[PDB]
Amino acid sequence: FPELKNDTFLRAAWGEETDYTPVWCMRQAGRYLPEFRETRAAQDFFSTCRSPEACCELTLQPLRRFPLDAAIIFSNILVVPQALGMEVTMVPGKGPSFPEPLREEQDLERLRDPEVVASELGYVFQAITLTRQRLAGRVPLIGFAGAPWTLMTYMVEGGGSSTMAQAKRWLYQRPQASHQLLRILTDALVPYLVGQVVAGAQALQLFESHAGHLGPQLFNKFALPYIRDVAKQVKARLREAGLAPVPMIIFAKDGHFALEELAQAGYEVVGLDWTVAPKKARECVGKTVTLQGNLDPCALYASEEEIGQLVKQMLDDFGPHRYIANLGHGLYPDMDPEHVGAFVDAVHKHSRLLRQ
Amino acid sequence: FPELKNDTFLRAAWGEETDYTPVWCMRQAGRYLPEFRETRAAQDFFSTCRSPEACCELTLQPLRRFPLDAAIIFSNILVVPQALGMEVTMVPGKGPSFPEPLREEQDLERLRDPEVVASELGYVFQAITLTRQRLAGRVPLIGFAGAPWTLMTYMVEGGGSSTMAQAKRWLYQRPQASHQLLRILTDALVPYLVGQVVAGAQALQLFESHAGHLGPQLFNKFALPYIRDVAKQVKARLREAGLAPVPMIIFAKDGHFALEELAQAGYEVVGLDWTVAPKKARECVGKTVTLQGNLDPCALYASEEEIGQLVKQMLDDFGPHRYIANLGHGLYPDMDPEHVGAFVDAVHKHSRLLRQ
């Protein structure tokens, strides 16, 4: 592949000093972009995900607008449960649904062997290779997947939930079957993630988007071991294959309570939601790991000038070292692209000012 | 297996009142679907049939597009003569062929004992189990086979024919050897069909696709006894095994002349081609059996609006009771998936309107 030209994101991820703070945005390819909506209007959601050219195009769109320091492949975390044999749908204005969720132990019988999932996700790898070629070394390309617990929640609940009451009911009433599911997920995720790197991904982010529904005791029992296993095994497989392991980011949304644990889980970067004060996060994770985040996405509803000030304060709190800027969650569909531009420009401006 | 969620097709099959008319389409997994062609391009035809994952995938494809009230396993009726020891080929753009057809009585010597056929058709049962698991109770899964006479026609003619002149020449010149063949077929079909149910099929359709070449006298002598024997014996074997017998559908294409007989042949459902006026069919079969059918498949070449009107008229003629909607034959390769969607939506809409 083309030689990387701007590697600032990777250097920060590994914890090296840089001349400025690199920045990207979760959902930078999203509906807040008119061109995103135009491109998506052609196919249905999971059809778009299966088209390497469409994913590559949506990936590149944000970078034509903003000098972001990383791209993330366009895809969805639900491609994994789909490749395990569950049927998904993207309900008109209503979001993802599995009309036949896993509700009892016996339901695990309809899943594929996790060892075959990577072969079912060829299309993601083709999107990854194409996008890495087309980016031509501009910035690094991030691959990603959902974390086991979070993927379990979608598979059991059948969609989103404000309580995760069914998935937590599995944890308390069906602990063994929960462990079996989580192990299936882990064993699918590892080869999928490795394959993303083989195909060209230069970093990886694991989204534990549903961490916050758990307290510490359940998280430590049911989410953390598999988060740790994913990192250990991805790195091992890559080493064995002759490849360079890439930086890995763990993002546990609403995970204030697990930050200490997550800093010892084998990830170079811990991502933060906007509810955790940067200084408290730094005290929790210590001085080696890199932090990523964490501006309230809704802050981008403020004026460009206000965004600038919010960004300056955020950057003062994180300090110049061991830090990659991002929002605290993905961009929302009603947000103004110019405000996203203001965020990006302000990270770049103040982080330089903060260095001299 | 997962508990069935939508059983409307089964209730209608048994002749119970439902809130709407359930609908499916013969060849719903077929070349009219671009994704069907993509999946099939990987292997050759009979290789596809031997892959449980490929059959399961082609089975599910139509249901991702349309809310059909039943799935039918992807397979072919010729797997039976192949398992009896005949060699088949799917000739490039030319259809099925047996390059060494049965032409004289002595040729029966190369067939397997019919009692061993089920063991040769393991692959179909594996496809059936997998598909039933993966459907997760969404709708019922229909298994199927060719009827004895129709299978005989392929074995003697070596393919399709506009006259069935060789196979009919066996009926008139070789009646005893014809009966022997038809009995072989029946004795293979029974354990095969039972095994389909054991593996997960929730209904069964017997395709007498070549009925119309016969008049009443030949049909009553050579086709009907074996059609009746298949039902009697399948039900007996299932009962004996501790299982629930499933609804059975007999579809004699071009069989206007046998409808009275077929209504007393032990099948819950009689399927109709598009040449029989629904009201005349109802008069022939009487008031217990369920009718299935019968829209001209070529009607789907009309506009969506016209399909809607044709469907409304069809539904007025059948009435709300003892009726499962389908076409009068399988979908053709040049048909438009959106028109198939229109058919499905219109059965659902007008059948509800017809109830209140």
From Swiss-Prot, chains A, B:
Pathway assignment: Porphyrin-containing compound metabolism; protoporphyrin-IX biosynthesis; coproporphyrinogen-III from 5-aminolevulinate: step 4/4
Residues that hold coproporphyrinogen III according to the record: R27, A29, R31, N76, Y154, S209, H329
Listed result of changing F222L: In FPCT; decrease of activity
One GO-annotated biological process of the protein: protoporphyrinogen IX biosynthetic process
Phenotype for M155R: In FPCT; activity < 2%
Impact when changing A70S: In FPCT; decrease of activity
Name of the protein this chain belongs to: Uroporphyrinogen decarboxylase
The species this protein was found in: Homo sapiens
